[PDB]
Amino acid sequence: SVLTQPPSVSGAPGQTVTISCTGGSSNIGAGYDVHWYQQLPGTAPKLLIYGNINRPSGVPDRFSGSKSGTSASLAITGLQAEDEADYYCQSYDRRLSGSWVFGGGTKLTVLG
Amino acid sequence: SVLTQPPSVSGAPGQTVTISCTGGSSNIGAGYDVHWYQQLPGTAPKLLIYGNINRPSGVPDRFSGSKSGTSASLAITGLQAEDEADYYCQSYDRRLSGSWVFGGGTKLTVLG
Amino acid sequence: SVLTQPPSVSGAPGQTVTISCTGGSSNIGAGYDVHWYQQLPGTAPKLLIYGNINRPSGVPDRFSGSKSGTSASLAITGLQAEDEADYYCQSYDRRLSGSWVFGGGTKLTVLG
Amino acid sequence: SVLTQPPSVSGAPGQTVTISCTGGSSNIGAGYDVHWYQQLPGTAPKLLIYGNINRPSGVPDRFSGSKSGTSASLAITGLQAEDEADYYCQSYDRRLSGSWVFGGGTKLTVLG
Amino acid sequence: SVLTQPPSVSGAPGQTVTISCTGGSSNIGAGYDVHWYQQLPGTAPKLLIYGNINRPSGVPDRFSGSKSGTSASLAITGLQAEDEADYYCQSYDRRLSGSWVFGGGTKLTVLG
Amino acid sequence: SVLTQPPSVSGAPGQTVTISCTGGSSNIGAGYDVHWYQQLPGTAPKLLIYGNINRPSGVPDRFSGSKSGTSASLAITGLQAEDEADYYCQSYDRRLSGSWVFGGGTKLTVLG
Amino acid sequence: ANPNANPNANPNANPNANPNANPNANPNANPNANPNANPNANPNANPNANPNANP
Amino acid sequence: VQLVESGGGVVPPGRSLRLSCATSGFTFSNYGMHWVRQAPGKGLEWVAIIWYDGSRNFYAASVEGRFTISRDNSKNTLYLQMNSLRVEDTAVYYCARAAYYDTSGYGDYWGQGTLVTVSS
Amino acid sequence: VQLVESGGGVVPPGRSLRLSCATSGFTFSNYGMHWVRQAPGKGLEWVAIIWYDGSRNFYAASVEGRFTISRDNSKNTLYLQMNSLRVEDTAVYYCARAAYYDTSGYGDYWGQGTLVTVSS
Amino acid sequence: VQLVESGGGVVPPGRSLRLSCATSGFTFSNYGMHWVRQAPGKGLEWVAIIWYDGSRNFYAASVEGRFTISRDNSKNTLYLQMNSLRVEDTAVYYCARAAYYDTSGYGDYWGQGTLVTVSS
Amino acid sequence: VQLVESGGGVVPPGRSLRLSCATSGFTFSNYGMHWVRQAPGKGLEWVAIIWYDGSRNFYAASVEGRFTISRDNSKNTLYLQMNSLRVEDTAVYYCARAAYYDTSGYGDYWGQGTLVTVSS
Amino acid sequence: VQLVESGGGVVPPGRSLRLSCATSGFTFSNYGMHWVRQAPGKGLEWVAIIWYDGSRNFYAASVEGRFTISRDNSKNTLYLQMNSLRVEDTAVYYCARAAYYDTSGYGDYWGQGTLVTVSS
Amino acid sequence: VQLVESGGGVVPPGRSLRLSCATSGFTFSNYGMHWVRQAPGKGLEWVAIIWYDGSRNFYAASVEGRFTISRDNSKNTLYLQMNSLRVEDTAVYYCARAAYYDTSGYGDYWGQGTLVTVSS
Amino acid sequence: VQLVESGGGVVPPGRSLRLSCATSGFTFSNYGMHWVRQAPGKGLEWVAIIWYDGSRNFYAASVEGRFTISRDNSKNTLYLQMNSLRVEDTAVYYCARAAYYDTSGYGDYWGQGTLVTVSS
């Protein structure tokens, strides 16, 4: 893991929960844009957020986020049972040879 | 639509009016040249201004313009009744896959 | 020898073995199609593979080919005792006067 | 009239007279090589300088020149009466569809 | 040599021995990251420490270091017989034309 | 002369003598392959080296060469008395109409 | 400065380049090409012919 | 310079429709071409580009994979093949001749346009 | 846009395996491609990138020198050739289409992946 | 190297006129050719170019679509066919042999030209 | 398709030998032919090609000028005339039917060959 | 491979002289040919090239328009026809067989040449 | 990752000598390279750097103007050409792969080294 | 490191003169350059500086607007173009290689200079 994410987050339906993603001077505070992906239990990840705040037309305005300093964040409002998923952040570490770096992912559990 | 234009401008014949076009770091302040087109109610758009300040030999010097920062502008002096038209700006947006992007388009009404 | 082949390959019946052939920017990585021939001890070479991947209807579906850059390849699955043979690659070297160029051949021994 | 040249230059026999040629980022500072031609009153232009500094075997060393930034120049030393002529610069404008562009042309008057 | 290292350090197996590296305002106090290399008696230097505190996965967690002001240091704990080696510090001196500068190296002697 | 060669080089038998060939962006740094020819006092200029490093089977292994940037070179090691000859380099100048360009030739004198 | 190749660059084709023919290229015949016969061609010239002896 | 649209009309959704522009007055084979469209009551939207030699093609994100752009230099004609037309594709389609200034391009000559309606 | 993967399975360690991703719905030749992998129970690891014209390739440090990425535009196919497979290479491999935003990039479309197991 | 021109004359506007540049002293088939013109009292204007094998042609914006450039390699002759002549086309026309240096080209040998006058 | 070869045997160095490949099962006159050779214990070496109508011939550099390839289409027979034989020319010579795929050619049917021995 | 030359001698200025390079040992018809010359005491000057099928000819600027290069495949012979000879043309002329590697050409076999002297 | 030095030996002062490294296990074209040296009994000294695309070169003050660094990406080879070798140039020369951390750089992989001795 | 000036001489006021400095022994493109002058009886006066990549230029107030400094990296040459020469410009002009220490810079290598005289 390059970007730090909590391993777990949870809350009751209807609540607001957030998932953090913390980097440093080489990856987030470096001016590199942060992206988020959503993985459902039996499939490939889906782009959720791009460009720190933008999102595909296939994503409802329930998901939004921001980036400040070295800390990025995904906010989920109006939490539904259907949001159970693994959420990952992505950026670029100028100290590494790879195009993308990922955090370890956070599992969101909805307390139905 | 990625370039911002007012939906409407106006003035009496003999007046001076301007039409703005505002973008950002991806398409105006990005160093991309801004172009303008004029559309009359029953036909195809006609190139009015190119290269930010230049114009086809078929355009009288009543139309001129320039670009600075993230804001481009079309100036019309000596407004005539004949100038009623839709004016559009155009540029390149480095965040998109397409060669051209347009603004919303501004309708110029001459208050005869 | 124009194309480079290892002198020997082997394995037990039922195993998978591969035969390589590596050229340069003048003969394989040059975009020329690589062909393979199989020679049995008392006769002429037989066309095994053509067009890098294709083969005659007279060849068992145990053989197939491939190509990556300057490296051409022959794969034999389901190795049989009857596959003992000399395997040769063939291409065209743009720096030479001949229509065909060959590697030196790879000797396949089946450990039966 | 793409490249800018003074309409006229002069000097007395034996003196040094230079003829300038100024372009922009589209045709001199653009990396395009500058060429010069000499025209006498009743004939076709003759290549005088090519490749910014080189010249045909038909040109005496009285004529030489250079290119720097968006500026280019033809120098005539040891000015002769015979040098009364029209001099033109030539380059390629990346913004235009034509292969060659010419400057306005300069007449050199020898003060005999 | 713009970085000063002691020529020799020593200790008994099991002891902790530190190797200093002292620079100045042009290299260490200037903020350039310090690196360390280890050379064994008949081979090429091996990267030991990079980025002041990080190390390749091939380095035992016995080696660590720090950077403060114009000083830098390599600490070796749990000294083993196998640590007899020459250790060098590396940085960048902004007053010189070269990309890297080295200290003179320190020989570590294990008093077996 | 298009390619620059020294008029003369020398050395005693057993020594190493090299012959340079210097061009420019029009003929060596241009990516064009460099060739060398050996002319003995009363014969045709026999091919010595081709393709920058290769040679006919009729050439003793005492001759070799290289190409880098706009420079190229012929090296003779184990210099023999019989190597007295005129050496020429050959390439292609992208600014000229001819297929081949040559340097003026270098005379190799063996100090027997 | 980092002397290494830079990952993290746009890997996609660039739809912002002059799409027109370029009227600035050597228009002359190129005296730098293999002048030889080229022994790399189909020696079986028979897949397509006029069944009529005449056109 | 004339650019003349042809082949418009109306289709049920799901059907294909093929548009083209006949050209004259310039050397067709030396220029790249663009298609743009304008839905009634709306502004202009870029649709596609084809390079002078056919080597590159780019499409708007909203049509890629459904629309194909092509050309035949021997007939001085530009074509647009639209498959799986949607109601949302109703618009006037126009040809334009590619031109380029410096850091961005533009169309200089425009056609007259033709209307394609998709409706059940 | 659709990305389809095939070629996984199980092999003894030390063996090679060639995976591929077939694509449709977009112009393959205009986009770069990525491979990433996810070991069972783990997060995502970036593996490799290939440029739209094949001019550049970058690999994760953990696989460089063992894996090769390549493509064939005429068949709309992305390939990954893995040599010297290790047990640690067991993962679901996925292809993705390269996209780029401003100061960093991202994948937008993803395939469903294929499973590669390396084991005695 | 000689370039010899013929075909000027005077025509009413709207009429056509054909110019011909005969060449000798060099291998015609190996070179591209140019036409330029000079209106009386004015500087030089580039008009057109033709590639050595006739594969490409380019025209000045002010004449494109009205002028045709062509060549017959078997007769070592360069032609310029002008249709719909305007008064503004009055000029001395010259042929020239194409040459090219590095980043731009030039003409080296020039003909003596011929005068075309368009007048009512 | 069947190719039959005859003509090998031992010939003193310097002397000549003629090989003949008799053919049937195909229209001989519509196909080109190849000869390759294999010295005992060695790999394959291409020797020569002849075009279907004899309009073009190529030889390996090591035999060019010593060997002649020809066809008598009316007898469905391919010949190879080797003059000034050297010991190094000892090999099994094989005929094959020329074939061509895309960027390179190949043989798609092989004869059995005959052994040519040159020896003192 | 033999390259044999004949035809030199003393020529009064203005007169013509023909050189001929007879060849044998290779397929003349499959290769292009070159001529170079060496003025006494000087280095080498490239003079001319002819393509294997006669489709292209190129000449050094110093001789273009005065020299003609030709060939007759039926006689395996290369010719150089020099008209209007000048004193400056005195040189030993040599023929050579064309060869090519990757980005530039070269000669491999050379004839012995013959001396052409042009003098009052 | 292997880096292998070759070309060492002993020369008289004033002579030239050329060193090189072959590499494997990584993409050579994606990384810059360094040369360093160590005189017997001495510490390390930086000698030169070359950028991944060959665009920039920097040299130690004590060798600039005498040493040249270069690379051939298609051969995975790094070269160092030393002219006018001096006695003071006796050293073991090493290749290293460039890496960069944040405010300064470092080498990560090293070769084995080769010895160059300069003596009369 | 050798720096050599050229181009001095005697010029009447109001005329122009161009100086240059040829360099060798170091990588020209990696360093900035300076010009200074010394009036024949005075101390040293700084005249101008140009950055290694040509992006910046600075001039002494006494010459700004009359003098231009420039470089040609491909010729390893530094130039100074002096227009509108005044009598006060008589001096020996020298080139020097830019160097920088910490809070201020300096020249390390100097040329020999050339004399420019401005006088009726």
PDB file of C-alpha atoms in Angstrom, chain I:
ATOM      1  CA  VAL I   1     -17.273  -0.369 -24.608  1.00  0.00           C
ATOM      2  CA  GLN I   2     -16.504  -3.936 -23.724  1.00  0.00           C
ATOM      3  CA  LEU I   3     -13.293  -5.605 -22.631  1.00  0.00           C
ATOM      4  CA  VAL I   4     -13.116  -9.406 -22.611  1.00  0.00           C
ATOM      5  CA  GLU I   5     -10.403 -11.428 -21.010  1.00  0.00           C
ATOM      6  CA  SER I   6      -9.280 -14.951 -21.557  1.00  0.00           C
ATOM      7  CA  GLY I   7      -6.228 -17.093 -20.951  1.00  0.00           C
ATOM      8  CA  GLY I   8      -6.046 -17.783 -17.229  1.00  0.00           C
ATOM      9  CA  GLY I   9      -5.783 -21.248 -15.703  1.00  0.00           C
ATOM     10  CA  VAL I  10      -3.305 -23.048 -13.494  1.00  0.00           C
ATOM     11  CA  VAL I  11       0.323 -23.741 -14.169  1.00  0.00           C
ATOM     12  CA  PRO I  12       3.352 -25.168 -12.289  1.00  0.00           C
ATOM     13  CA  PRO I  13       5.760 -22.439 -11.132  1.00  0.00           C
ATOM     14  CA  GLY I  14       8.485 -21.581 -13.579  1.00  0.00           C
ATOM     15  CA  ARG I  15       6.097 -21.977 -16.501  1.00  0.00           C
ATOM     16  CA  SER I  16       4.974 -19.304 -18.908  1.00  0.00           C
ATOM     17  CA  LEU I  17       1.391 -18.230 -19.679  1.00  0.00           C
ATOM     18  CA  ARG I  18      -0.057 -15.825 -22.271  1.00  0.00           C
ATOM     19  CA  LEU I  19      -3.169 -13.820 -21.419  1.00  0.00           C
ATOM     20  CA  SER I  20      -5.178 -11.616 -23.692  1.00  0.00           C
ATOM     21  CA  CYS I  21      -7.881  -8.957 -23.696  1.00  0.00           C
ATOM     22  CA  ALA I  22     -10.107  -8.593 -26.727  1.00  0.00           C
ATOM     23  CA  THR I  23     -11.828  -5.309 -27.153  1.00  0.00           C
ATOM     24  CA  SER I  24     -14.819  -3.833 -28.878  1.00  0.00           C
ATOM     25  CA  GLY I  25     -16.984  -0.712 -28.849  1.00  0.00           C
ATOM     26  CA  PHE I  26     -14.130   1.770 -29.283  1.00  0.00           C
ATOM     27  CA  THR I  27     -11.177   2.501 -31.481  1.00  0.00           C
ATOM     28  CA  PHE I  28      -8.457   0.338 -29.994  1.00  0.00           C
ATOM     29  CA  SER I  29      -5.689   2.067 -31.889  1.00  0.00           C
ATOM     30  CA  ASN I  30      -6.422   5.400 -30.199  1.00  0.00           C
ATOM     31  CA  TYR I  31      -6.000   4.310 -26.579  1.00  0.00           C
ATOM     32  CA  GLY I  32      -3.283   3.053 -24.304  1.00  0.00           C
ATOM     33  CA  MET I  33      -3.996   0.050 -22.107  1.00  0.00           C
ATOM     34  CA  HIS I  34      -3.299  -1.175 -18.599  1.00  0.00           C
ATOM     35  CA  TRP I  35      -3.098  -4.393 -16.672  1.00  0.00           C
ATOM     36  CA  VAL I  36      -3.626  -4.588 -12.944  1.00  0.00           C
ATOM     37  CA  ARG I  37      -3.965  -7.568 -10.693  1.00  0.00           C
ATOM     38  CA  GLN I  38      -5.650  -8.583  -7.490  1.00  0.00           C
ATOM     39  CA  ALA I  39      -4.312 -11.478  -5.471  1.00  0.00           C
ATOM     40  CA  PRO I  40      -7.207 -13.211  -3.679  1.00  0.00           C
ATOM     41  CA  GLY I  41      -8.037 -11.371  -0.459  1.00  0.00           C
ATOM     42  CA  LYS I  42      -5.804  -8.430  -1.424  1.00  0.00           C
ATOM     43  CA  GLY I  43      -6.188  -4.937  -2.862  1.00  0.00           C
ATOM     44  CA  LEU I  44      -5.163  -3.770  -6.302  1.00  0.00           C
ATOM     45  CA  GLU I  45      -1.633  -3.771  -7.711  1.00  0.00           C
ATOM     46  CA  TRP I  46      -0.734  -1.943 -10.875  1.00  0.00           C
ATOM     47  CA  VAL I  47       1.180  -4.205 -13.271  1.00  0.00           C
ATOM     48  CA  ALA I  48       1.878  -2.624 -16.661  1.00  0.00           C
ATOM     49  CA  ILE I  49       1.075  -0.029 -19.327  1.00  0.00           C
ATOM     50  CA  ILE I  50       1.430   0.120 -23.053  1.00  0.00           C
ATOM     51  CA  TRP I  51       1.133   3.298 -25.114  1.00  0.00           C
ATOM     52  CA  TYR I  52      -1.370   3.606 -27.988  1.00  0.00           C
ATOM     53  CA  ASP I  53       1.370   3.186 -30.627  1.00  0.00           C
ATOM     54  CA  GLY I  54       3.503   0.690 -28.698  1.00  0.00           C
ATOM     55  CA  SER I  55       6.340   3.246 -28.258  1.00  0.00           C
ATOM     56  CA  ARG I  56       6.500   2.990 -24.477  1.00  0.00           C
ATOM     57  CA  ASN I  57       6.087   0.356 -21.885  1.00  0.00           C
ATOM     58  CA  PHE I  58       6.374   0.566 -18.150  1.00  0.00           C
ATOM     59  CA  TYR I  59       6.238  -2.210 -15.610  1.00  0.00           C
ATOM     60  CA  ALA I  60       5.795  -2.560 -11.939  1.00  0.00           C
ATOM     61  CA  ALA I  61       9.095  -3.254 -10.258  1.00  0.00           C
ATOM     62  CA  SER I  62       7.757  -6.564  -8.981  1.00  0.00           C
ATOM     63  CA  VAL I  63       7.351  -7.938 -12.528  1.00  0.00           C
ATOM     64  CA  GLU I  64       9.720  -6.028 -14.793  1.00  0.00           C
ATOM     65  CA  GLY I  65      11.975  -8.389 -16.680  1.00  0.00           C
ATOM     66  CA  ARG I  66       9.590 -11.295 -16.302  1.00  0.00           C
ATOM     67  CA  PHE I  67       6.441  -9.916 -17.886  1.00  0.00           C
ATOM     68  CA  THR I  68       5.990  -8.514 -21.386  1.00  0.00           C
ATOM     69  CA  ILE I  69       3.105  -6.313 -22.505  1.00  0.00           C
ATOM     70  CA  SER I  70       2.206  -5.999 -26.163  1.00  0.00           C
ATOM     71  CA  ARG I  71      -0.606  -5.313 -28.579  1.00  0.00           C
ATOM     72  CA  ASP I  72      -1.870  -5.957 -32.068  1.00  0.00           C
ATOM     73  CA  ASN I  73      -4.047  -3.217 -33.368  1.00  0.00           C
ATOM     74  CA  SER I  74      -5.334  -5.159 -36.356  1.00  0.00           C
ATOM     75  CA  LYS I  75      -7.107  -7.612 -34.084  1.00  0.00           C
ATOM     76  CA  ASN I  76      -8.059  -5.160 -31.363  1.00  0.00           C
ATOM     77  CA  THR I  77      -6.102  -7.209 -28.847  1.00  0.00           C
ATOM     78  CA  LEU I  78      -3.985  -6.530 -25.779  1.00  0.00           C
ATOM     79  CA  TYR I  79      -1.578  -9.235 -24.609  1.00  0.00           C
ATOM     80  CA  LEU I  80       0.366 -10.064 -21.480  1.00  0.00           C
ATOM     81  CA  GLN I  81       3.076 -12.667 -21.667  1.00  0.00           C
ATOM     82  CA  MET I  82       4.243 -13.884 -18.342  1.00  0.00           C
ATOM     83  CA  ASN I  83       7.481 -15.791 -17.990  1.00  0.00           C
ATOM     84  CA  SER I  84       8.913 -17.473 -14.909  1.00  0.00           C
ATOM     85  CA  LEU I  85       5.666 -17.492 -13.022  1.00  0.00           C
ATOM     86  CA  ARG I  86       6.028 -17.561  -9.262  1.00  0.00           C
ATOM     87  CA  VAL I  87       3.561 -18.593  -6.597  1.00  0.00           C
ATOM     88  CA  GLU I  88       3.280 -14.925  -5.631  1.00  0.00           C
ATOM     89  CA  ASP I  89       1.925 -14.156  -9.129  1.00  0.00           C
ATOM     90  CA  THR I  90      -1.392 -15.872  -8.379  1.00  0.00           C
ATOM     91  CA  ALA I  91      -4.036 -13.235  -8.988  1.00  0.00           C
ATOM     92  CA  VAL I  92      -6.976 -12.153 -10.980  1.00  0.00           C
ATOM     93  CA  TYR I  93      -5.650 -10.120 -13.831  1.00  0.00           C
ATOM     94  CA  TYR I  94      -7.722  -7.362 -15.361  1.00  0.00           C
ATOM     95  CA  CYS I  95      -7.336  -5.223 -18.419  1.00  0.00           C
ATOM     96  CA  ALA I  96      -8.419  -1.606 -18.455  1.00  0.00           C
ATOM     97  CA  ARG I  97      -8.579   1.248 -20.895  1.00  0.00           C
ATOM     98  CA  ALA I  98      -6.228   4.092 -20.211  1.00  0.00           C
ATOM     99  CA  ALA I  99      -7.672   7.496 -19.504  1.00  0.00           C
ATOM    100  CA  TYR I 100      -5.957  10.617 -18.328  1.00  0.00           C
ATOM    101  CA  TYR I 101      -7.287  13.601 -16.492  1.00  0.00           C
ATOM    102  CA  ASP I 102      -4.831  16.353 -15.690  1.00  0.00           C
ATOM    103  CA  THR I 103      -1.891  15.714 -13.415  1.00  0.00           C
ATOM    104  CA  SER I 104      -2.483  11.958 -13.147  1.00  0.00           C
ATOM    105  CA  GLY I 105      -4.354   9.233 -14.987  1.00  0.00           C
ATOM    106  CA  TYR I 106      -6.994   6.597 -14.380  1.00  0.00           C
ATOM    107  CA  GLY I 107      -8.743   3.611 -15.890  1.00  0.00           C
ATOM    108  CA  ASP I 108     -12.320   4.073 -16.998  1.00  0.00           C
ATOM    109  CA  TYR I 109     -13.492   0.862 -18.570  1.00  0.00           C
ATOM    110  CA  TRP I 110     -12.621  -2.479 -17.068  1.00  0.00           C
ATOM    111  CA  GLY I 111     -12.815  -6.069 -18.203  1.00  0.00           C
ATOM    112  CA  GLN I 112     -13.975  -8.835 -15.887  1.00  0.00           C
ATOM    113  CA  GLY I 113     -10.578 -10.430 -15.555  1.00  0.00           C
ATOM    114  CA  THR I 114      -9.269 -13.965 -15.596  1.00  0.00           C
ATOM    115  CA  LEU I 115      -7.656 -16.045 -12.862  1.00  0.00           C
ATOM    116  CA  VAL I 116      -4.090 -17.190 -12.981  1.00  0.00           C
ATOM    117  CA  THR I 117      -2.932 -19.702 -10.422  1.00  0.00           C
ATOM    118  CA  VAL I 118       0.638 -20.682  -9.967  1.00  0.00           C
ATOM    119  CA  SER I 119       1.090 -23.815  -7.928  1.00  0.00           C
ATOM    120  CA  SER I 120       2.863 -27.149  -7.583  1.00  0.00           C
TER     121      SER I 120
END
